[PDB]
Amino acid sequence: LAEVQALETLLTRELSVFLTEPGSKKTNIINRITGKTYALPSTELLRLYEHLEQCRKQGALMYFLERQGTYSGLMLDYDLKLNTNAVPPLEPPALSRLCHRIFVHIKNSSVLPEGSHKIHFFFTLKPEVVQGKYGFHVLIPGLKLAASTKKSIIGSLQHDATVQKILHEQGVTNPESCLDPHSASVPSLLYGSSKLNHKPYQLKTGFELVFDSSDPDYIPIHQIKNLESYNLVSELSLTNEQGSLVRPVYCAA
Amino acid sequence: RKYLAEVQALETLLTRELSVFLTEPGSKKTNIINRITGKTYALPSTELLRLYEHLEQCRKQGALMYFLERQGTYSGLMLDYDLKLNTNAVPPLEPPALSRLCHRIFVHIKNSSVLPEGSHKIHFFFTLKPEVVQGKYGFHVLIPGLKLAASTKKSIIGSLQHDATVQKILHEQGVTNPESCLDPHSASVPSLLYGSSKLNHKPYQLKTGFELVFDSSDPDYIPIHQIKNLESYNLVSELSLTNEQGSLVRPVYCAADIAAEKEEEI
Questions:
Q1: Do A197 and B39 touch (CB under 8 A)?
Q2: B contacts of A12 (beta carbons < 8 Å)
Q3: Rg (CA), chain A
């Protein structure tokens, strides 16, 4: 396939010069198929994302991970046990309410900057239920958080009664223990990538949340309408700072 | 002479025979990747040899294969050298230099204290990439039969990077990067099955192979002999890091905490 050939040429001819040693801290990108680790500067990260995005649109086998490190976007990994083997509905109102509750915990961490800021939430879903096992990722890639703050936010989210209700009404039988408490530290799959035994999560719905420190009770959440218009590998990346839709908002460390 | 039909037949057989091993949630860890079709398979060791016989037939008929085997947590050793030469100088890599390389590699294996007791034949194979990519000359050392824990491979690779005798040997071959030519991911990288390659790159070529005999009772006696009749064997089979049913290469099983190794493979 042409776009896979293009990605192969980019990796071997050009990005090979950024190969990191096993257990390096400069590592930001992991190709688990080739077992290679890279520290890509922002320019070369984008070039990678353009190739991965072309490969994604053609359904190519990818297993790319990004390392969250100490300061990056927030990822929530939900591992659901369901009532049935039917994909739960997860319609915009349920996902919208999830975003609001997630935000209440972010706000309560006290690290948000003053002023008016857009933050984007993306929900990628396991394509099918297997033996009642289901999953979604919540990506807030633009909201740059300290690892310690992510862990704190995740701790609070596990105990959220409203979130547990939403998940229960979706048919989740483990609403108390479905959020991976290591969501803050685990390497995070790039959009279109998966473990070699699984299929890649699919973007169902994204939301734009605007917060304003001057008007704290006004928290508008709206579906993003022209998602297809953007490079989704790029926009959904927790470590990217040069997205078009997703512009970074820097939280206190 | 272009075996269009026979290769197509083998491709259909492979897709059908592999289809039952297509990886899924709850299935075993993928060990075989067909990078052309992007399909991932978990073959029981029992079925690997049948795959290797089909890939060997495809190789001998000049088919462009792109099969990888995954090393996982327990498999044969593979050392991935990217050598920087004087512009486009091809290193001689004659038997005496390669023989000494085997000896040094073995000293680190022995020092790891994972070898099983008794007498064992351990086969070393040297494959070289025919073309220079970017002044880089590619060069694999395969010990496919010596089944090692990933953690032991990483340890052996670390020792080989800092081995003064190995650095000398590489230097005398015309290598200008003897300190940074050994890929520190050598333990985790996929291995192309013999005759497979990246889509427009050319396959690695077997130059020369050695039989080392080790005996736990007599550890200072390390006879190494060039193998003479290499083309007589199924080379996909014998060179495979995951194979256990080779004819030339009989597996020697080193100590591994299999579950521990699977936790450390994060």
A1: no
A2: 133, 198, 201
A3: 18
